[PDB]
Ligand binder design. Structure first.
Ligand code: ZN
Ligand code: ZN
Ligand code: ZN
Ligand code: ZN
Ligand code: ZN
Ligand code: ZN
Lengths: 84, 85, 88
DNA sequence: ATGTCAAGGTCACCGTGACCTTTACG
DNA sequence: TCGTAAAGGTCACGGTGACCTTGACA
C-alpha cells in the first residue's frame, strides 16, 4: 500500500517537514515559510486541495499543510542542504 | 467625478471590452480563456470573491463572473483581426 | 558574454522549448502552438527577425522559431504547471 | 494630423514543481 | 565505503496584466 501526500493525495516522495508529502507540497511549504508569505482565501476557508486541480487555493493549501502536521521548524533559516 | 469600474473585479475600467465596463486585466483573461477554450474548476462552492486583489485566486469564479456580468464570447474574434469598430 | 536569443538576438532568459530564447519569443511560440495560429507573410517569407523588428512579421518569426530548433512538443496541451517536461 | 475607442498582440515578471545537489547517518 | 533519506537549489514551464499596435471614425 503506497504512501500518499497528506496534503494533495499525490504520490508522496518521502517524509518532508514531518509528514508524508509529495515534492510539490514540500516546495510550496518551503517557499511560504522562507518568505513569510501570507495568503487569503477568496471563499470560506475549506477549498478542496487535490492533485487533480492544475492550481490550488494557496491559503487553504498552506492551512492544510499545517493541519496535516508540517512543521515550520523543518524549514532551515541557514539555507543548508542535506543532514539530519 | 469617480472613475467607471470593472464589473468583474472593481478595478478601474479601461473601457467597454466585450460588451461590459471592464479593465485590461479581465479583458485579457476573458480573451485568453475563449481563445484557448480553457476550462477551470472551482475548489470551493462557486462563489469566490472576485476583487482586484483576489482576481487571480479563482479562475473558475472569475470566468463565470465575466459571463454573469455580460461579457460576450462572440466579442473575441476568431479571425484575430485588430482595430476596426 | 550573456547568451543571446537564437530567434531575435535579444538577451536570452533561458532555454525555452529547447533553444536559448528570450521571454518575448518564448511567449510568441507558446501562443502560436496553443492556439494553432497560422500566419501569412506580407512581404516575401524572408523578413529580418531582430529585437527591434520581431513584432513586424509573425509568419517569419514563427518560421525562424522552428528553424532555430524550438520544439512544439515543449508547449503543454493540458497546461500542466511547473516542473520538468519530457522530450523525444 | 490628431484624438477616441476597442479589437488583438506583446512581453516582463512571478509561482510552480520535476528533477538536481548536498548532506549526515546507519 | 556505500546506499538512502531529506534538506535546500535549479530553472523551464504556464498565467497574468500593463502597455503597444492597429484601424475605423470624427
Ligand atoms: Zn502534495
Ligand atoms: Zn480556499
Ligand atoms: Zn477587472
Ligand atoms: Zn471559486
Ligand atoms: Zn527572442
Ligand atoms: Zn515576413
Amino acid at each position: 500500500p503506497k504512501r500518499l501526500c497528506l496534503v494533495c493525495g499525490d504520490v508522496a516522495s518521502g517524509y518532508h517537514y514531518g509528514v508524508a508529502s509529495c515534492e510539490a507540497c514540500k516546495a510550496f511549504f518551503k517557499r511560504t515559510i522562507q518568505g513569510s508569505i501570507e495568503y487569503s482565501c477568496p471563499a470560506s476557508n475549506e477549498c478542496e486541495i487535490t492533485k487533480r486541480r492544475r492550481k490550488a487555493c494557496q491559503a487553504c493549501r498552506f492551512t492544510k499543510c499545517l493541519r496535516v502536521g508540517m512543521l515550520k521548524e523543518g524549514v532551515r533559516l541557514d539555507r543548508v542542504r542535506g543532514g539530519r
